[PDB]
Amino acid sequence: GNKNTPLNSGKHPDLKIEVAIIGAGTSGLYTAYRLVTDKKFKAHDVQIFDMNNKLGGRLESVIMPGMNFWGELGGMRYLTSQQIVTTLIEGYPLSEKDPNKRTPVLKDKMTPVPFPMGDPSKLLMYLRKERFKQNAWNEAQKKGEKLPTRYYLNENDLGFSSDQLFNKIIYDVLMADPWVAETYGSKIIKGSSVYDYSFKLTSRDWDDIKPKLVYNFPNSPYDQRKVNDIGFWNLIKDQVSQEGYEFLANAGGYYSNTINWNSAEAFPYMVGDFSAGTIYKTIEEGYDSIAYAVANSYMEHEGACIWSENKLLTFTKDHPLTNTHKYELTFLNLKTNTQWKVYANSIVLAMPRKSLELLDQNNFFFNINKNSVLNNNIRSVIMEPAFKILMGFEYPWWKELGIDSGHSITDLPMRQCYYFGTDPETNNSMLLGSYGDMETETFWKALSDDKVLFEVKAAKSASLRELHQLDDVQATKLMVGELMNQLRELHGDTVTIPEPYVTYFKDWTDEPFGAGYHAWKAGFSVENVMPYMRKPLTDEQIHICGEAYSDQQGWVEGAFCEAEKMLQEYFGLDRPYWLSPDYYLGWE
Amino acid sequence: GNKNTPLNSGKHPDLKIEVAIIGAGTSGLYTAYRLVTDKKFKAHDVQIFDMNNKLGGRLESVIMPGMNFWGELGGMRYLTSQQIVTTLIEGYPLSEKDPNKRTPVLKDKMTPVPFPMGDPSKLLMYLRKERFKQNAWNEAQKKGEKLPTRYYLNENDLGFSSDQLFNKIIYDVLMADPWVAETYGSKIIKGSSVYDYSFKLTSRDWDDIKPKLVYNFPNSPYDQRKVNDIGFWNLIKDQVSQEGYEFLANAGGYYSNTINWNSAEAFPYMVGSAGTIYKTIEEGYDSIAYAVANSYMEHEGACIWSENKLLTFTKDHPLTNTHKYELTFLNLKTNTQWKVYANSIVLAMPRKSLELLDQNNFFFNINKNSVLNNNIRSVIMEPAFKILMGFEYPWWKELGIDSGHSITDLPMRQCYYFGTDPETNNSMLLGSYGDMETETFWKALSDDKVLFEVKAAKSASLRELHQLDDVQATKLMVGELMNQLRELHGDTVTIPEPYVTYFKDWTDEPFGAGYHAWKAGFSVENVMPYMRKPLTDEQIHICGEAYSDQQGWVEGAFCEAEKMLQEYFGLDRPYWLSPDYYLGWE
Ligand SMILES: Cc1cc2nc3c(=O)[nH]c(=O)nc-3n(C[C@H](O)[C@H](O)[C@H](O)COP(=O)(O)OP(=O)(O)OC[C@H]3O[C@@H](n4cnc5c(N)ncnc54)[C@H](O)[C@@H]3O)c2cc1C
Ligand SMILES: Cc1cc2nc3c(=O)[nH]c(=O)nc-3n(C[C@H](O)[C@H](O)[C@H](O)COP(=O)(O)OP(=O)(O)OC[C@H]3O[C@@H](n4cnc5c(N)ncnc54)[C@H](O)[C@@H]3O)c2cc1C
């Protein structure tokens, strides 16, 4: 099938090429695909290297025995307003509604499906031991009530849901800047209902606002500072009190980023880049199918090669072949523990902050004594931890509360569970747990570090034969134990929860990732850092791309967009023919 | 005065000695002091090296203009049951009550004083917007009430204070182990009041219990596991619910460690006696570091090399006939490297300091010394930040607050009302945060470039105050701390702006932490003796607070150094130290 893309765990000592791409994630794969498809180099002269035994980086889809559908260890969904990932998956143009009348860009067949949001009638919000339905705030407001909670909000914020309060905070901040309220008042909209705030601000509008927006609150410790220079927890507490911050931080799930990051960058991240008709979708064959579709398109050019289980150690300008090649790269061939040299004229580091820090810091590129600016910009983002646990049950116990799909949210350390689906033949049913924020990394770490692993157990269409293949990826007994205990407290006593037969634990804080996703720090010029990272030194053909230093952090689109900007800026490529000239990219 | 201990910022290329001590913190200073006082080596053959421009490491006392008394940036107090730091400060024996009838161990004069605890009638607990007095739980229980709070406790725990609930948790866990309830039931005591739990477990009893204690709770995810293998947040939630954990985590400040660290190690850390009190040193707590440094330095040839940073060390060098090890130092004043030759290396330095050394040498090499690397990572680096703030008057006295500290779930977490100059009335507050993600709340503010501007006050000229320009907190941090201090105390007291601040971030290199905490699942009884000499064929030792069993204390640093000294440097117990003070296995 399409996910058997060949991977070379071998080596070719003294390989000579033009472009070394390090990282077979979304950005690396897309760089390789674009360079060869546009004939900028022959396939043999553009090679990808990865230390992993798979392509896709933070996309990793899995089929667990007994359950014939894809679980997601990493990314799961896209937005149709994200035009690179959307066009590459669905084909062009995006104006055609008939998928049959669309021209595919990539050969691999990918079945787009809507991403289940579920029923807010049946999905749980479990905060300070109070079990609400997610529609509790809506239901209350229809009866003209202000829903009481065990958070002590400011009086003027009482009855607001988390969504409504964020919308209010962002409205209040934008409209206190005279220049913003005047220049964009049209697209910053107070409705008639006290809880009704909407935004029509485009990605390009946000690019105008973010660097200029001033925090205009006369008694605030943060008065007259760029909102850029204010952490998001700082700003949310200043606006709705620390009890307000506890409500918003605890009542948001994976998508909702309430760490103390760049408030200016946080605003668009929370209200969107305007919308109508855009929905969340995934790929029936698993979301990592998009990585395999780009890899396979690159690999259909003979000479193309993904080197797997090959780890970049270091690179230097001081080597025997400076007549043909500016750079010598050293790789560790993990299978053999043998080092080998590669010669290249361009290096693309398609890899996140932690991956950059794990490279030899003593070389000409990273040297702190020389490149203090590089090192400051590498540290311009927060490494956010993310963990995923997939759990297979003999039946979907959640259906007893009328839950089909979607996710429950709680201030318990588990934070979130997605009811991910039921094999209609075996009835075997998948849950995924997603935690990491509000110190929950430290709650779970002790349990995930324990040595005694969960034992697989036979179930419908899942033999011990098949399940012992996943022995080494099982969650720990203590983690499964405590997650079962928290799932019982979350759902309540009315529903029996059986033990799972199979688990799959993934820790994205593991090297070389060191993070699920990244978040701009307060006080950095993001408009200046991004173009800098795409080529840090004026006299070196070394580029950084991927999600970490994108302005769409937490998304494949971020990784594709930084690669695309890098390609137009330094590799002489035009916008792809399949990409609308009106999709907004950046300054260039 | 006693704090002008000479420091050599220079270098001596190819210096040849026996024992290189890296770190002029409490453990390094005490190693040097013990080796020369017991004449194990001549003072020229035992040298201390530090990258800082002062000795004392995580002890740093300061006098700020306008206020004639010592502020503490780092450690502030000791317990009289901590027998090394207590004897070194006060002299021997510890049974004598008259300080005049005591024999000093060190020449420097140090004035012991009680550490002000304050009045729980007047000190604040501000949790989820409810302002209690710290005695609210006691007062309620006297009127036979169960004090209500905005934490939703299990019903069987309602009305308990944070102290009472911890005591209950620890009682319940110990008594569920048949072997413990039977072997130590005598010293694990339920009173008649529902809230009354006390302990008489000694350090030696805890060393017996910690490695064996089993968690006996049949429906628990953690049932039949060593308590050693359970994180403390894990254990507290299993015992009093996640809302119970929120209560205990938020209502502790004062040396209350509720991170997800080793539960077995956490138990003694929480219940601790009688007659033992908290004390400080009137001349500032770093005086104990200066007293040990000065005692070492009164031996001819003794030297603290300051602003000299260890980079690396190797067995592959030109002088292996006289010296097993060549050390390379960065002379920070010149940015030049120089070699030192030695037969023993003592790394008197915490986890982050070890990690900042050249990891590629024979010692740290991960490909060979995987157990060293695992054990270096056996402890959590707990962040700590301190902000001293000088006010023209003690605004806190208006609420009848003399002294002690208020606690809150606001990000500021804790303020100590540290004292008032009786002549100028200038009054010092210290803010202490870092836990419960408060590191990330404050970091954005502390990293901002625009610094708080000093302002003249009684007996504090701009002349004197501009000397501290570069250590002022940021305007944003002072701004937000003032905002949180007003919400903490309430509207009944006006709080003026400070005239001076002093910001200290202990997460800065090379410290990387205020203090350390054993992780769950490590054999601490086996890691400690390992860290004091990791490789059987190398004379390289680690000592200090980080891998002690009294983390967060000078006593931990002294005790690991003392064990290291008796184990590998052929020293006897000091004559001034009681043979009955329990040290470890050896
Ligand atoms: C839990 C989770 C949920 C997510 N949800 C979504 C979502 O719903 N939708 C979405 O669009 N995005 C989502 N994302 C992001 C998505 O996973 C993207 O792939 C991600 O944004 C990163 O792609 P990238 O090119 O930056 O590289 P990465 O995926 O970070 O790839 C980096 C690669 O570099 C390799 N590498 C690093 N160092 C070296 C070295 N020295 N030598 C060799 N190889 C090296 C690594 O092995 C890896 O393969 C999610 C991420 C996570 C973790
Ligand atoms: C906020 C705070 C409050 C505290 N409160 C108390 C308290 O009230 N009472 C109490 O008893 N204890 C307290 N402690 C602990 C106390 O400060 C002790 O000093 C501490 O426990 C550690 O002493 P140490 O020997 O481990 O070394 P450290 O104090 O960590 O000294 C290490 C030294 O090594 C040096 N160094 C590191 N790397 C290198 C290198 N490569 N080359 C050269 N030099 C290097 C550093 O410059 C430093 O001087 C507190 C700690 C903090 C942070």
Numbering used by the authors:
A (entry chain A): 0 to 587
B (entry chain B): 0 to 271, 274 to 587
Publication text:
In this study, the crystal structure for the ligand-free form of AncLLysO (AncLLysO(LF)) was determined at a 2.4-Å resolution. The initial phase was determined using the iodide single anomalous dispersion (SAD) method. In the ligand-free form, a cavity at the active site to recognize substrates is occupied by the side-chain Y254, which is the residue forming the plug loop; this occupation would bring about structural changes of the substrate recognition residues, such as E383 and Y516 and made it difficult to predict the recognition mechanism solely from the structure of the AncLLysO ligand-free form. Next, we attempted to represent structural changes of AncLLysO that are induced by the binding of substrates.
Progenitor sequence of the assigned 28 sequences was generated by ancestral sequence reconstruction, and the generated sequence exhibited L-lysine oxidase activity; thus, we named the enzyme AncLLysO. AncLLysO has a fold typical of the flavin-dependent amine oxidase (FAO) superfamily —the Rossmann-core fold, which recognizes FAD, and a hot-dog-like fold, which is important for the recognition of substrates. Taken together, we assigned a novel FAD-dependent enzyme, called LLysO and bearing a main L-Lys α-oxidase and promiscuous monooxygenase activity, from the database.
